[PDB]
Design a protein around this ligand. Structure first.
Ligand SMILES: O=C(O)CNC(=O)C(=O)O
Ligand SMILES: [Mg+2]
Ligand code: NI
Ligand SMILES: [Zn+2]
Length: 331
């Protein structure tokens, strides 16, 4: 068995290997990358996502979100308070202000220590889930707006034609912006490209150990767990590496820098934080190996998780018994 300790693997494809996306994901899995739940892909030196980032300031962040925390430093929830619209140029100036900017630090480990000590005492503002793309249309390799769609994969594997579309999303971050513990909708893959700016630190639990994280979460968030049998779908709960280690939960960590891709694998729980002003692009995708995970994915039916149009069909075809209850949650 490849990668039996479930370590995060880092890949350096050549320009020739970067042509065929599906083939390279299958290669990484042949080497055991999915056992970690997360992999890093450094593009070949010949590749670029676009020519420059000099002209992005007029993108609108229609609904910036202030991430307000409750709890203790290592075990907290966050809620998202909606703020007034602002452009990317306005948000960058905000991120760089004395109130929000990254503090002085020695290295990524010192910054990580400062994040976990102090996150709860601040409320950073995140531009999230903004439909769009920063890949140039002429970038042919690993262009996250030109991937094969999940609806087409389900049709190729299972023969059933379904409605829905699959497009990328942009994220604009600042120091302390936080992504809560979660798996993807329908336990899909994700791919994330850090276009510019400061790094993103990730934490991940191997898929084979995901139920250990769920059991700890039910212990640490006992009201939330009574409210919903899949409350991590709400994307609000944070648990620090120190708390995970104290409770014996297997996990790994890695820092993504500008110009790098990360892939999350089906049922790989992940969480993390931004180091300073940055912009990322991400999208979900599927492979044949995903289908069995889609069929088994938990679902929130309490009403909180509320998701895209295209998840309807995935539930309807892969999880017909759950469909009626899940759809009541959506309506
Ligand atoms: O970058 C972020 O805020 C969150 N992204 C992801 O969870 C992802 O790519 O799966
Ligand atoms: Mg612009
Ligand atoms: Ni994710
Ligand atoms: Zn719920």
């Amino acid at each position: 068995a490849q990668n039996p300790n479930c370590n995060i693997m880092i890949f350096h494809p050549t320009k020739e290997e970067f042509n065929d996306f599906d083939k390279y994901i299958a290669y990484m899995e042949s080497q055991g990358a999915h056992r970690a739940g997360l992999a890093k892909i450094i593009p070949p030196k010949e590749w670029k996502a676009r020519e420059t980032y000099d002209n992005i300031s007029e993108i609108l962040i229609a609904t910036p979100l202030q991430q307000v925390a409750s709890g203790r430093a290592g075990v907290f929830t966050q809620y998202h308070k909606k703020k007034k619209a602002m452009t990317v140029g306005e948000y960058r100036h905000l991120a760089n202000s004395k109130k929000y900017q990254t503090p002085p630090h020695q290295n990524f480990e010192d910054l990580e220590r400062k994040y976990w000590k102090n996150r709860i005492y601040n409320s950073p503002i995140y531009g999230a889930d903004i439909s769009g793309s920063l890949f140039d249309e002429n970038t042919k390799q690993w262009n996250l707006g030109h991937l094969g769609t999940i609806q087409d994969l389900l049709e190729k594997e299972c023969g059933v034609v379904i409605e829905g579309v699959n497009t990328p999303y942009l994220y604009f971050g600042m120091w302390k912006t936080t992504f809560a513990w979660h798996t993807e909708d329908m336990d899909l893959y994700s791919i994330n490209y850090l276009h510019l700016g400061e790094p993103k630190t990730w934490y991940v639990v191997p898929p084979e150990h995901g139920q250990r994280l769920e059991r700890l979460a039910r212990e640490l968030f006992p009201g939330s767990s009574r409210g919903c049998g899949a409350f991590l779908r709400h994307k609000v709960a944070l648990i620090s590496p120190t708390v995970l280690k104290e409770n014996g939960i297997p996990f790994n960590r890695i820092t993504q820098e500008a110009g790098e891709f990360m892939v999350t694998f089906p049922y790989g729980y992940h969480a993390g934080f931004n180091h300073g002003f940055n912009c990322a692009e991400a999208i979900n995708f599927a492979t044949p190996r995903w289908i069995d995970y889609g069929k088994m994915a938990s679902q929130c039916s309490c009403g909180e998780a509320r998701v895209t149009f295209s998840m309807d069909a995935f539930v309807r075809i892969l999880q017909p018994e759950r469909y009626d209850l899940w759809k009541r949650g959506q309506d």
